Ligand binder design. Sequence first.
Ligand SMILES: CCCCCCCCCCCCCCCCCC(=O)OC[C@H](COP(=O)([O-])OCC(O)COP(=O)([O-])OC[C@@H](COC(=O)CCCCCCCCCCCCCCCCC)OC(=O)CCCCCCCCCCCCCCCCC)OC(=O)CCCCCCCCCCCCCCCCC
Ligand SMILES: CCCCCCCCCCCCCCCCC[C@@H](O)O[C@H](CO[C@H](O)CCCCCCCCCCCCCCC)COP(=O)(O)OCC[N+](C)(C)C
Lengths: 128, 178, 603, 156, 459
Amino acid sequence: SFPKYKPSRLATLPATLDPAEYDISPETRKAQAERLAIRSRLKREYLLQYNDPNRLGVIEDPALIRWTYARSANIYPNFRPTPKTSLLGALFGIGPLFFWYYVFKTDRDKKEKLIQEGKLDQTFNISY
Amino acid sequence: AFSAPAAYLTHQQKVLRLYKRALRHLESWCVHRDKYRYFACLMRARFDEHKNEKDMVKATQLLRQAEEEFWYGQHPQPYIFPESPGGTSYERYECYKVPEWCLDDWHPSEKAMYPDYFAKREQWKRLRRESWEREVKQLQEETPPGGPRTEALPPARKEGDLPPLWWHIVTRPRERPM
Amino acid sequence: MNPFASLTLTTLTILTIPIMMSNSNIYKTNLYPNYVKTTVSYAFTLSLVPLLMFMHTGQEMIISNWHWMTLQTVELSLSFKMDYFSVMFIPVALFVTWSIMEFSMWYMHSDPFINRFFKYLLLFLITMMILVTANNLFQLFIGWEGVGIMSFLLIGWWHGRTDANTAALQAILYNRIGDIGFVLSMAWFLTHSNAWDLQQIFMLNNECPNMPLIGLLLAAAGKSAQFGLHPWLPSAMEGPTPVSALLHSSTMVVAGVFLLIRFYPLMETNKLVQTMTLCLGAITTLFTALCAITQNDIKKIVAFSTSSQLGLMMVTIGINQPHLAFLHICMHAFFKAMLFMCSGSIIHSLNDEQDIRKMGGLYKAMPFTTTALIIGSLALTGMPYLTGFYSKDLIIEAVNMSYTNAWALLMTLIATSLTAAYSTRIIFFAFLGKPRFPPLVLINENNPLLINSIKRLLIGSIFAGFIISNNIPPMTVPNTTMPLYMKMTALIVTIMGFMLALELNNTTYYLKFKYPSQTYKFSNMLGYYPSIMHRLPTYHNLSMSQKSASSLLDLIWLETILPKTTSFIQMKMSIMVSNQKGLIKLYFLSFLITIMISMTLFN
Amino acid sequence: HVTKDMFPGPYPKTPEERAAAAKKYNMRVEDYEPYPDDGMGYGDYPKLPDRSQQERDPWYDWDHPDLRLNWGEPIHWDLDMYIRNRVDTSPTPVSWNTMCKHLFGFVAFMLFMFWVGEIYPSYQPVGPKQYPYNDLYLERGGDPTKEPEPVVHYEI
Amino acid sequence: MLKIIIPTTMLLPMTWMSKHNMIWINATVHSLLISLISLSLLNQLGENSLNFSLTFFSDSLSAPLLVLTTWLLPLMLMASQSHLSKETTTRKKLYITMLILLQLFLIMTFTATELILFYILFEATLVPTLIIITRWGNQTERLNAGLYFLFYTLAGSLPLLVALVYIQNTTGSLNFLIIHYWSHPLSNSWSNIFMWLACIMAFMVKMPLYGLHLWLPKAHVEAPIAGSMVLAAVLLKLGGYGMMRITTILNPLTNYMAYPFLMLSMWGMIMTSSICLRQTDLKSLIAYSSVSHMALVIVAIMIQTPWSFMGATALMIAHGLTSSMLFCLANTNYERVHSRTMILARGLQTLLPLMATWWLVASLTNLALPPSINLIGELFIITASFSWSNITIILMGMNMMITALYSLYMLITTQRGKYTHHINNIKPSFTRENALMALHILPLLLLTLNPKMILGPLY
Ligand SMILES: CCCCCCCCCCCCCCCCCC(=O)OC[C@H](COP(=O)([O-])OCC(O)COP(=O)([O-])OC[C@@H](COC(=O)CCCCCCCCCCCCCCCCC)OC(=O)CCCCCCCCCCCCCCCCC)OC(=O)CCCCCCCCCCCCCCCCC
Ligand SMILES: CCCCCCCCCCCCCCCCC[C@@H](O)O[C@H](CO[C@H](O)CCCCCCCCCCCCCCC)COP(=O)(O)OCC[N+](C)(C)C
């Protein structure tokens, strides 16, 4: 035996260490066959449109269109005001603003108090 | 690369892949030639010990301990051929690869130079224009109903036939176009 | 007027003529690289004259020639500082660039865009000369950013390669992290000293505060690839070997150190920033040497050597010895440029192979490269009376004889050990054994360009230290008296490194094999810094910038608040108001109700 | 050329529309799995494995060799985050936790030891450097109209 | 000032009486001549202003914007020549009429000695842009975009009008000169707070402010190329010009009232820069980059120092030129590929090298590479902000880093790598497109030689 490899989100499990590939059953082989069949049908359609001498443009990709549409225009109709969504929206959209406001307000209050007290030493400060 | 993939890898394919990978990483560890030869003979003797095994369940229990051992001792910086997918010149010359259709957009003054080349080019284009209309029918009649099951293409079976979908394989730019 | 002033400006000006002729006919021919090389050689021999004048009398000038915009009490002008640092660094950089271009005419011969490569090399040289001679912070920033853009363009020279583009963007990212501190320093100096000019900054800051110096230190760490911001320099080896030898080895990467040298009157008045500089340099030199001693790519080993040398320069700055740091810059230029040139010769002779496991006995197969690499390694490790001796020996003596951190001193000594170790690693694995390259032997050194370009820097690496050290005036008090053992510390540490690394390398011939340790794994994957820090932050940034900023706020909530709420409210109000069944019974009942309300409400 | 029925829709609730959505994305019904039905606008879009494009087979003949994609296959929601120019998830020789521990251990020990060396510095058996004229009072800041206290240096 | 206004009006009869195949040539020639004429307003004074008459006056804040506005029309005509080729003569003439009307409204808006006249022309500009977007836009979302672009604006602009007339009832005048000379402090009151908000929000929504910026990606993605050019180059700068003009009567209430807008801008510039990193659309990416730059301009105007105003002027001019160039490059790609998706057409440096050089220069100037005027404005604003508070340097540096990141990401995605195999309709770039890019970029690098021309009245 040897020390174990532990996968993570950003360092995934290697293919050759998966228990899944070594559990072969007829349903698994059938699923692999159908996956290869789908990929081969798509490849045949693409190459048929690709090798055509009469085609003179972009081969339109429905998968890319679906990707861009889902990323951009399908978000709001599928939005639902949810405790998770509401809390994350409020946090990520308001908390930074108030955090930065507090920081800058404290900094400028300290600076203003110092300049009123005269102990700031602003010599040679001509450009603002 | 050139050959089409299958739905799955068999057991002996997995064993041979592990053998090649282990020997490559062993020679990465064993820099010198004689040391590598010695330890490679040891590795081969270790592989062929279970060569005649008939219990497939026990054989699959094997190769799993073997791949775990490989991952433990896999030389985190293996040697890679420079043009291989991890090498130092893997995609170095892709910026010099230009498609063949770009020549269609050359100015006539540019095509005035190299007249023989362009004449051969229209020869090729006519060949493609006829062969394609024949190839579509050939592929249509040869393909099982319900779509292809494997992404393998048939050869030319008649006399004047050309292999279907041959154009973009035959007219590859070059390995070193410039 | 005085000749000294005219010569300094003419060097920089005639460096730009091939760029003007880049649109002419010569740029379309095969004579353009030779034209650029000849121009650079003429600029070098012309710049040798102000160096002689300074060596004779010490002539110093400021040339504020063109008045650019004036901002109320702040005046901005094109001004050049021609002090000792400028008039000493310009000839060295020009000499190195001349050798590099002559080497490139042999190395990049089959490249279709070789004129563009030389045009690019010249543009980098011009930007670096702008950086070095700048008298104000805006001009220095111009050079700062120009060298960065040129490095981005030259790393991603093969733009069809994904890794080259990744490395170029990496360099840009880390240098922008440093640019934050650069811009902070500019803002502070303008707000408090009312100038970006160096004379007014020195005059008005008798005791410089922490903030501007910390900004300068952050900029220097970014551009010299110190420990926090180090990986981009080894990642930059994606570019062609001449680019690695010129930019990322000896000229551009010292820029950050040069910045700290340029502001040394203010640095010497602050103890905290000095201590931070010293500690950063010590950890950088140790960590990069530790990563180097276990690498298999030869260019990676030389890049890690460069990073360790830069860390040593930062240590010298941190012990308040800026002139010695400048001298180290000048010496390292020579011998590290020759080191990369030898590496590129090996790579070309072995069909673009960079792994040392696949190069064997080249001691006899190609002997001029062998002797040049031996001389360069002896200069780098520090061999008495060579170019690296006159700087590194004094560096180690000064660090020993000073009131410093004990940890920084220890790390510097261990880094010297590791320098000897990776030098002997390169020699042993690339020249001493049996051949391990493919059977078709294409080994060939017989090209006048390669031989001449390498031998010029070889003569430099042999004699330049003696000549320069004996010609410059003394800028510091010497360390005349030392304990005998503490005088011999550098040599004994170097010998210990040589012997121990040679002994550990000789065991690879034994017929026994064992799996590596955790220390080896840590050293080989670069402390795992590139892994974690290039996967954890980036992902968490990118994911966030799509999940929260783009979808959650911009596409959902900012949309929900103003426009969607207005649309919903108006839609409901319209549906309520307009939906009347047309029954005048209800209309006149409403009329009666409003009549009585008007009677009971407004009087 | 894309019809109204070929665009992403709302989260599928029934097995029939689940199968229809799996058909839309050119993938098996068994392999199809939408994102969990929360307020986020994922709707009806496959949740593909979170692997990077660097983990895809480089020896397969892709239609887009540099991106390692085929023409008709479904695209991961975060494709532009995994493009071999950006974050990748490829397995490493050492575990992520082990690398984090070692890198963290090294950095923390270095910082602690630099602090310790600050507490316990190094120097030589010498006294302060001596300068002649009142420690160069006039040459370091000046103020000649004050006549500071003289400092006399000891001959030994 | 009529020597510029009258030729612009004469552009209309000249357009409508032109031959069917002579409209573009004549319009371009005479627009270039009008630009040359307008170039003589750059001779400004260190004294008050160039007060031509009771109705129009010129300033060193007004003159650079006027020159940019005049220079933009010929470029818009060149860019629109291509996609409007299959169009009827009457509709091409109507498009050119919309462009000329927009120029006339902008020219009169920027001089406009009166605040009510400024408001009237400032809102008159809203009509031709709306028609251009909703009529000659390609997608079905253009109508929606127009609606947004309209109502947002009016949501801010109706209160301003009320405040404006209110001011004249108390002051007695809305002339900029009398307003400036007779300014009196604004007390810290609820009435004065709401007057301040009414005065500010109209110009704040048009920058746009980070919270109110949703209309901009819609309008830019949906508009034709000339519409995008004029929106990014000139129409966004109306808010900056108006704020600089009107903040003279809002003191000292600006010190307290500026905090929410300052926080919104300093955080939203980071937010929009990060948004640019994950964007599948070129036009949307360029729009978000514009939002970030205008956030920096808002910070500059709110800080309200001499260096802030100089940096704001320089950044407005520089961003106008750079964003117009970026939109033109993206449109040249779109007219070939018809997709507008960044990931689709790749490796274009190998197929179109000179256009790759144009892309590189535009990305470098968007990245604020010194000594470009982009960086001059950036650095002046950053220094003013540092004096305002030393902690702003964190957000400014982060914004600079993210800006470099997405600029080079956009360059590398489209120009580097391997070409897409199935795209074979990529033709060599036309002389018209190369000349368009050159006419965008050479003025920027010339302006860096004489920066005081674009540094405003506080120079
Ligand atoms: C005051 C008196 C002065 C005199 C003092 C004494 C003088 C010298 C005496 C010598 C003393 C030791 C020297 C031996 C060096 C090691 C050589 C060796 O055996 O390596 C093989 C061996 C394993 O090799 P392998 O796995 O079999 O490799 C397979 C093949 O060989 C693969 O091989 P390859 O072909 O791939 O490449 C070979 C490569 C691969 O080898 C490696 O794996 C590299 C790693 C070992 C070398 C590192 C040495 C320097 C370490 C600096 C560390 C600084 C602090 C870091 C803090 C980290 C702690 C987290 O090795 C080399 O290149 C040569 C090694 C370089 C050594 C030569 C010069 C350095 C010695 C200097 C020592 C100090 C004197 C300084 C002089 C001035 C005096 C002030 O290495 C080790 O086992 C490591 C031993 C030492 C490492 C120390 C780090 C341990 C940290 C553990 C955690 C501690 C707790 C921390 C607390 C945290 C709290 C949060
Ligand atoms: C949405 C996308 C962006 C859009 C633009 C956003 C920017 C608009 C933000 C408005 C700026 C601030 C408004 C008023 C600032 C004055 C300071 C005051 O609010 O704070 C305290 C005031 O105390 C309380 O805040 C009283 C007001 C509480 C009621 C306001 C509702 C709070 C949250 C509502 C936010 C919704 C904004 C959008 C509306 C559609 C100060 O204490 P006090 O010394 O006593 O008052 C001094 C001022 N005096 C002298 C004139 C009286």
